[PDB]
Design a protein around this ligand. Structure first.
Ligand SMILES: CC(=O)N[C@@H]1[C@@H](O[C@H](C)C(=O)O)[C@H](O)[C@@H](CO)O[C@H]1O
Ligand SMILES: CC(=O)N[C@@H]1[C@@H](O[C@H](C)C(=O)O)[C@H](O)[C@@H](CO)O[C@H]1O
Lengths: 277, 277
């Protein structure tokens, strides 16, 4: 048996598979070594997963997570996985999951639009070019975190519509002071900012929300997608933001003169197909 | 004798005064209750200040600091001051220091452009309207933290001039991965981002830098200043970024049709004048 895990910072998708047949699917909280220590990751995995995962004999454990950028960061997750599963674990970027999941052994451009945002050029085996994500502060354009950051900024400065302001404070039972506390004082701020993508998904009628989405989606293209040879290679998307705003993403694509066809919610479906050889 | 202190997240200016005569002035590190606990601030004051401040008997303590949003946050700083000085302390926002320091008892609009950015309408007694700063993440347009946040974003995205990228990494001896840790893992990220404002001041000849300054300075006016009756009231700036980029700030001022003639480095000179009667 093999285990494939895909994390994006908000949720971690676990797939216990046999060849190509899925045995069990479980979701835990997101795993990111920029926001979690080795102890916190180990706790998350053990609390999140049933005992059935830690009982079944595993040959390899394939992990793809956000934050797994450097060797030091990949060591944190790996040592945590090895501790729990007693199995050689291969920790890679969630961007490689997006690449393998969307293309298998084909060439093109794989992108992520979820909690964070990332992009790469895939030749069919390895990532040739990769514009750095930068995290929720120094990047992640067109991501849920970027949407929420822009939204909450407008909420605090009363530049968003009143209906949105009132509905936000009612739904989350917060005050401006509390919003300040969650972002700066409470952990996983990137989750809370990204969580606002789900909130604003119901207000697609408002001009503000359309303007918020488009401007962020365009910002992703201009800074990430534009850097690649995008006019000659297929561009495929993965992520919650991509999936929920598939119409607006396709619109932005057409603005930059590209035809976005494949928009998957999770790259996991293709990862099982990929890890079947 | 009484003590006037002014903090802006990066540094704290201390003025020991009798009436309007300065006895001693010392700088320490910045005090922000969003980034520091009560025990951290107490240690910063105790070790930071000379033995001259503690042996001298004080009448009142006037403290204005960033992060002193609610009464809850002010109490943190207040408890620290009383524990050190053993004299009633008055903890307010640094925005009120800007208002009292620039206008005294006159009506107008006081603005801060330092590590963070803040704005208000001062009627000569109290702050009437206050557009929330939002902090370095959810606001602070045209601030030092905004400049650095945008610059380092471009650095990682390989969208900034190569001359700036190379000089940045050479100055700090950092790699892309290292910069990621300084912002996300290592404390006082807002300080490091704002410090990049000092860096970009050398390269004011580059079109990129001029374009980056003007972009942020306008964003401050658009989102903060223009919420007030700005065409019928004097606007006066204070802060390190305001002082350093006084030429470009005055440029933005004339573009919006206001005469920015008062730009100060610190509002301390006015606070010494204020606290006399
Ligand atoms: C440090 C951090 O959080 N970055 C992550 C990315 O992680 C990879 C490993 C990277 O750093 O390149 C991730 O691909 C995207 C999409 O989820 O979101 C970003 O926020
Ligand atoms: C939470 C925080 O850091 N905010 C501060 C402001 O603090 C006041 C108290 C406020 O938030 O109203 C400060 O005036 C400006 C300018 O220095 O910078 C912001 O970043």
């Amino acid at each position: 048996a093999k285990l494939i895990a895909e994390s994006g910072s908000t949720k971690t998708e676990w797939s216990l598979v046999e060849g190509e047949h899925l045995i069990q699917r479980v979701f835990t909280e997101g795993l990111n070594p920029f926001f979690q220590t080795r102890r916190e990751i180990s706790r998350s995995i053990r609390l999140g997963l049933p005992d059935s995962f830690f009982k079944r004999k595993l040959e390899q454990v394939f992990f793809y997570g956000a934050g797994c950028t450097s060797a030091e960061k990949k060591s944190v997750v790996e040592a945590s996985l090895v501790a729990q599963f007693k199995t050689p674990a291969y920790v890679e970027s969630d961007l490689l999951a997006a690449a393998r999941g969307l293309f298998q052994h084909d060439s093109g451009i794989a992108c992520i639009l979820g909690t964070g945002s990332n992009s790469c050029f895939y030749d069919g085996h390895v990532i040739v070019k990769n514009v750095r994500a930068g995290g929720y502060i120094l990047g992640d354009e067109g991501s849920g975190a970027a949407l929420g950051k822009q939204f909450l900024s407008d909420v605090l400065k009363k530049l968003a519509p009143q209906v949105l302001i009132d509905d936000f404070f009612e739904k989350y039972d917060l005050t401006p002071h509390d919003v300040m506390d969650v972002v700066y004082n409470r952990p996983f701020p990137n989750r809370f900012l990204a969580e606002q993508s789900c909130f604003l998904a119901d207000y697609l009628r408002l001009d503000y929300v359309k303007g918020l989405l488009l401007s962020n989606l365009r910002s992703f293209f201009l800074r990430n997608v534009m850097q690649y040879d995008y006019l000659n290679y297929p561009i495929r998307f993965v992520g919650s933001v991509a999936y929920n705003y598939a119409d607006l993403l396709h619109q932005v694509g057409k603005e930059f003169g590209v035809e976005l066809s494949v928009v998957e919610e999770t790259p996991m479906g293709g990862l099982i197909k990929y890890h079947a050889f």
